[PDB]
Symmetry: D2
């Protein structure tokens, strides 16, 4: 008897349209509704009982925290239903990785949750979205997906929503993780090679059902000749934490350190991430005296991932030692 899968559409390239078959890169996002996406893959009926809902219709670079909450709360309601076995979210690529991590942290369910997009719109020749959507539904319908946390199923892969990132522009292999794909999906079947290590979903201390509004968190970049201007301005305009997207191992210019000390003293969390994203991690107390300054390192998480975790964590704690524990467990 086939699994019951709900597709939650949010917009994106997978729902996009361009002017000609050769327009694989120049198009408008968020033009097709969920029922047209489903009807475009008649084979979905072979692998699941699918129904669709239009949660929003956006280009994902324009997503808001309120959009994350609305989507996350709808996912939770559906997960609580005995009529729902798995959930697929169709999404723009730009912030797919942010949504996927958010859901991984706040959805206290073992039911499969898959986020999926495309790099080419469906109007293009050789568009990737049809098979990606088929694969998302296959994975969301597979017993092997239960308890694995949020998954992303592009490029014939099963990627962890935690640490997959949009890493390559244009090409269909865009989404990569420093820690590899966990599996592959081919001709409807899932093949697993690794399991998650980090806390997720049912083993998370966080729950979307308790979050009413997310704390404001912003990101500032590190580079030669950088000043403290962006950090100070972002804090002045409401940032409760700043993600520092440092050079190297989360390093901080000597012209920036004093401002970050003052901001921490005034209650703003300081989280050291980096723009060195293909591998490794930011080590506590290496580039900066995090203990002395009461700062946090983002471990392996890229800046936009670190922002997501910081927002969720700060719904529970203002203790920088607890925030560091969270950045070491999730």
């Amino acid at each position: 008897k086939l699994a019951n899968v709900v597709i939650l559409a949010t917009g994106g390239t997978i729902a996009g349209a361009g002017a000609s078959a050769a327009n694989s890169a120049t198009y408008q996002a968020a033009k097709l509704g969920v029922d047209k996406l489903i009807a475009g893959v008649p084979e979905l009926a072979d692998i699941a009982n699918v129904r669709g809902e239009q949660v929003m219709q956006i280009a994902s670079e324009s997503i808001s925290n309120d959009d994350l909450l609305k989507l996350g709360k709808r996912v939770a309601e559906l997960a609580e239903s005995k009529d729902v076995d798995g959930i697929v979210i169709t999404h723009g690529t730009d912030t797919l990785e942010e949504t996927a991590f958010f859901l991984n942290l706040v959805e206290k369910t073992d039911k499969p949750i898959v986020v999926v997009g495309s790099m080419r719109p469906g109007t293009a020749m050789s568009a990737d979205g049809m098979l990606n959507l088929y694969n998302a539904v296959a994975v969301a319908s597979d017993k092997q997906s239960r308890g694995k946390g949020v998954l992303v199923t592009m490029n014939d892969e099963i990627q962890s929503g935690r640490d997959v990132s949009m890493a390559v522009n244009i090409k269909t292999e865009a989404f990569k993780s420093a820690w590899g794909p966990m599996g592959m999906v081919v001709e409807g079947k899932s093949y697993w090679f690794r399991l998650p290590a980090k806390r997720h979903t049912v083993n998370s201390e966080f729950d979307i059902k308790q979050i009413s509004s997310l704390p404001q968190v912003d990101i500032a970049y590190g580079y030669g000749n950088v000043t403290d201007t962006a950090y100070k301005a972002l804090a002045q305009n409401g940032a409760k934490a700043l993600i520092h997207a440092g050079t190297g191992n989360g390093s901080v210019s000597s012209r920036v350190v004093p401002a970050l000390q003052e901001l921490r003293k005034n209650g703003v969390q300081i989280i050291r991430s980096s723009h060195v994203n293909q591998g490794g991690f930011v080590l506590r107390n290496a580039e900066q005296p995090d203990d002395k300054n009461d700062w946090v390192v983002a471990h392996d998480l890229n800046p936009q991932k670190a922002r997501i975790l910081a927002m969720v964590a700060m719904t529970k704690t203002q203790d920088s030692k607890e925030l560091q524990r969270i950045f070491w467990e999730y």
Copy 2:
């Protein structure tokens, strides 16, 4: 008989020291003067006649534009000397890629220029800097390096200074290019597999001998729920161009577009880069109407690289169409 190579020291991990041989990651940069670097590799005398100068002694995350100018001008003076065959710059990893690209754009010489760092300090077990420095001198001494633009010689590789980036934290393989290594250096010998295809050094329209100041350029990051705050603050504190480190294909949130239009009319150049850095490029007129808005795309160049090119280019032109040509040629 042997090539005359000058080593210009700037600091970094390659000049660093940690507390014990197990401290491969926690250390102080910029502790050893150039003479100590040279003494630490007595094998250099086998492959070149080496002389050293201390240009600065910094942690490279703290470099300034005045530092770049001083270094660039000293490189040019040495390259004009008949007593100099090649130049090696020892440098911290954090902003190595920024310096390397800067020199690639402004040094009108065919003489080899190599920038080199290390991921472990020389005090650590299995420190990488000794062989990296040996290799830098070998490559700077090799006739095959003439006319190839600025090179980076870590991890047994010959990388283009244009597009090599610090991509992996901690590990000695940190420096990668989307377009591959151009060669390798093994037991003093250089093996080439690709040539550059972008303008550099002697074929550049830019010349450090004509540059006495650099326009201020800053970088702002894109992510979910981003606002226009950092962009406006950076411009209010002097930025003549803003590098937009967007999601995806340089995409701009609908909450940010209006500010960027206002900034461009106020004369701030708007350059669309991305935090999608493993491959691909940002395509003009795809995500945003760059022709209508008089914006520029950074092509394949990551945000910190785009800042370097923009700042050099704006010593010559503020014509957005010329800036786009430059971003498509360099």
Copy 3:
């Protein structure tokens, strides 16, 4: 005003058919004729004046040396024609890399030659072949492609036919080079980032017009507990050279060295390649005393690539020192 491009069909997945739209991986190669294959991309007319020929209709794992000669000779006849500006070869993926390198060595033309395949059959949802074929015709029609050697245009990339290899199974990113893509092709436009640095096409010493037969070359694998059996059996059945696909840096088991010395004295060339294919190269005189034994190292070339170069080279020379020069130049 449009380039005149000839498409030479040879079979493969690009011309394949599976049972349903979900059969992206289980299919029959070499079912669709060239005319219907071209008619599947009517947009080709926008970028070139195309015509097709059916050279052969094979699954590429079953290609022969006679097939290579026939294809190579037809390519040369067309390149000599003032009615032809560029040539595209549609091909199965399995041995695409072998054909591409062969043509790179023996076609003394600056006219663009592109080899292209697909990872999914044209019957599958999200089939890659339509845009791959469009891109191959775009690249074959572009003035930027003149003089660049043989190219492969899958996954939105421009890869060198020399050193691109089938590296990833199933996925559309299958074809990779250790030395990176040279460029990309997006919405009909070619974007170059590197140039070749190895001898090819017009600068090759080899010429298909002078080659009527190819010497027999075979490949044997190295692994734990390997014996000399395959090496001896392949030479007994006609091999004029043996490609050793060694472990590590082309290493040879002590159980195998004596047989390879006796084979070399019997006139069989011994070429040390490896099954370590993501990067690096096999260094002469490191693992084995190549000068003493009169053996050759394959440099960076994988076993099947080394076979192609050896077979072409041995149409001209059997001097092991000349073969080593060839393996260092091509």
Copy 4:
């Protein structure tokens, strides 16, 4: 208190010596004894109570099945001892990946087992073996390593012994897995990001204590114009299974299929692997009718890995369906 770690030396580059400090690539393996290896890393005493044994002293390209059994049986004896908490094996790189997988299949212990080598000999500038050996002992002493299967600790990584392979020649990053590193080891500490998902060690159905001699298994390569010669000859000289290192998705030339059908009919197992090693897997019934022919696919495992698993599996079964199960579980 400190963990009790035993180092089992087998030879290799890590125990190698070259003529000068610049000889990072040209050297002699297997020159230093285990006590001198240990003495070269005096920091080991800080992290564990270490003792060494010299099991063998070989270049690993020359390893035999009897060497694997001797090593595997000594590992088992040590793992049974209450005086032993973890085991490190120092090994040549060439067949490190074969030993690591073998031990992962046949050692029924949760105690950590780490295999480690180096890409540069200890006589070279910037030699990698000291920190690799320190890291191997750190990981072998860590409670986090218990129950994880055999690990490989080069390049600051924790790699699974199952699917790590020597993938890059020369460089210290040689060992890579298609499924990513599982973790990293930095300044004595282990950081995990993924867990194994294939059967290993205590959950394996195989046990070194019952294996007296391994079945003979050999490997033959696929390429253009390949014949059935190597397959027939290897079987004639004792192969009980043949690993087919096919092109593409384990594809078999039409000139080879008939021979493999005859060999299977005569009792020789036929296992389809590939020389497409960076990612993906070989899919049953896709390229060849494995059910009709009673063949096996090697899943994601490269040829030399598939040989190891086939030998171990055939100590238990000659049933091709059970061999396929094993290739899908291990």
